Structure formats: C-alpha cells, structure tokens
Amino acid sequence: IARTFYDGPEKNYEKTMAILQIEAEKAELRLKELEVRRLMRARGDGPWYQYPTIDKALIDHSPKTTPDN
C-alpha cells in the first residue's frame, strides 16, 4: 500500500517547509504594504496619492500691457 499509493515523509515535510515560507513572506509583505500606504497617504512624498496640481505650462510669461502684471 505504501509503495503503490503513498510517498515518503520527506516529500510532505519539505513541501510544508516551502508552503510555510511562501505564506510567511506574503504576511510580511502585506504588513509592509499597509505601513507604506499609511506613510504615503500621510506625507504625499511617494508615487502614491499624488493628487493633481495646476500645470505650470499654462502660465503666460509675456508683457501684460501693464509693467506690474
């Protein structure tokens, strides 16, 4: 029965080790992502939560019929 239908204990052992590593990495990544999101939303210095500001290419830099603009 063991030879025909089943494998050794090492296979399940090491598959469990690999699975545990993957899930632990995922958990640490989720916590890190939550912290990064909190910091980016609080500060606004990262690539995220960059709300638009007015384009400075729209400004007209020409004499305006009045020296003081």
Binding site for other proteins (CB under 8 A): 5-24, 26-28, 30-56, 58-60, 62-66, 68-69
Q: What is the DSSP string of 28-47?
A: HHHHHHHHHHHHHHHH--SS
User: Minimum distance between the CB of residue 64 and other proteins, rounded to whole angstroms?
Assistant: 4
In angstroms, how far is CA 39 from the centroid of its own chain? 12
Contact 1, 7 (CB under 8 A): no
User: Minimum distance between the CB of residue 13 and other proteins, rounded to whole angstroms?
Assistant: 6
User: Minimum distance between the CB of residue 63 and other proteins, rounded to whole angstroms?
Assistant: 7
